[PDB]
Amino acid sequence: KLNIDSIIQRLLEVRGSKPGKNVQLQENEIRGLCLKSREIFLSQPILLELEAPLKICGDIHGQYYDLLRLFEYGGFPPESNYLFLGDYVDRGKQSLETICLLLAYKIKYPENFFLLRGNHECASINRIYGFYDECKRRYNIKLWKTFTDCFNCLPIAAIVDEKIFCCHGGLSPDLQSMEQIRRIMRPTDVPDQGLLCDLLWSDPDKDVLGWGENDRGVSFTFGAEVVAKFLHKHDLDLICRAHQVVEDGYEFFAKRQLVTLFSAPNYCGEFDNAGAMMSVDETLMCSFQILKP
Amino acid sequence: XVXXX
Ligand SMILES: [Mn+2]
Ligand SMILES: [Mn+2]
Ligand SMILES: [Mn+2]
Ligand SMILES: [Mn+2]
Ligand SMILES: [Mn+2]
Ligand SMILES: [Mn+2]
Ligand SMILES: [Mn+2]
Ligand SMILES: [Mn+2]
């Protein structure tokens, strides 16, 4: 019933229009995107096991014309396989187009296109930071509630060729095994502190060596010793994460055992940061493509 | 505004 190809065509039609130009999909089409993608999310593991070649992207935050630049640079699906690390909505002016395009590609290419949950794919947060207001202005609050149901089914982590562990935020002091992630049942809002909360919210910090206090008011910070012990225990080579604005779009932490990716250049119209994307090839070589501010 | 503007 859902015309996926026509939705994609209408979303891609504003390529090379004035940045900020809207695509007003019909409410029933947006609801169709949410309900179909949710079904696919639930049929696939909550801990994704993925294989290279793959382009990995960090926070987008509703900067729709920047998302199109990422695809223009990386190859529009299905030309390349993609993993996004979350934070699709809030902050920018076009969360609607942003999330609609990524959900459309998930439906269209369900084995070649992947999306993880970030801390902004959570009703409590997206209420304050822009996505609720955008839905109220352009559609209604019932559609925002619909997105909420879809977001609650997103997977939380990915492992790329048994070697690169991928999540939005970072590690947890309650994380002992990969089974703990697999035990997590969906749909879930994130009502309690603990493992799921930490995977969405936690931050590396060079001035703690173990676990520390997080300035955000939630979760923890983790030091280099933590990253090292984790990568050892589970026989892995790298943590790939997002969640923090960094100047060059990518930044290494903990003696290059972790990388942060941030994919939205000139974040909020305030920072002078680049955005970046990590390309992992078939021989597990990593490279970085930079989007200029 | 720290939730990170
Ligand atoms: Mn135009
Ligand atoms: Mn309403
Ligand atoms: Mn295990
Ligand atoms: Mn973010
Ligand atoms: Mn985040
Ligand atoms: Mn910066
Ligand atoms: Mn370095
Ligand atoms: Mn370091």
UniProtKB/Swiss-Prot annotation, chain A:
Hydrolase in keyword set: yes
Binding positions (Mn(2+) 2): D59, D87, N119, H168, H243
Residue numbers binding Mn(2+) 1: D59, H61, D87
Active site, UniProt feature: H120 (proton donor)
Activity regulation details: Inactivated by binding to URI1. The phosphatase activity of the PPP1R15A-PP1 complex toward EIF2S1 is specifically inhibited by Salubrinal, a drug that protects cells from endoplasmic reticulum stress.
Pfam family, one: STPPase_N
Miscellaneous field: Microcystin toxin is bound to Cys-268 through a thioether bond.
Complex formation: PP1 comprises a catalytic subunit, PPP1CA, PPP1CB or PPP1CC, which is folded into its native form by inhibitor 2 and glycogen synthetase kinase 3, and then complexed to one or several targeting or regulatory subunits. PPP1R12A, PPP1R12B and PPP1R12C mediate binding to myosin. PPP1R3A (in skeletal muscle), PPP1R3B (in liver), PPP1R3C, PPP1R3D and PPP1R3F (in brain) mediate binding to glycogen. Interacts with cyanobacterial toxin microcystin; disulfide-linked. Interacts with PPP1R3B and PPP1R7. Isoform 2 interacts with SPZ1. Interacts with CDCA2. PPP1R15A and PPP1R15B mediate binding to EIF2S1.
Name of the molecule in the record: Serine/threonine-protein phosphatase PP1-gamma catalytic subunit
Organism from which the protein derives: Homo sapiens (Human)
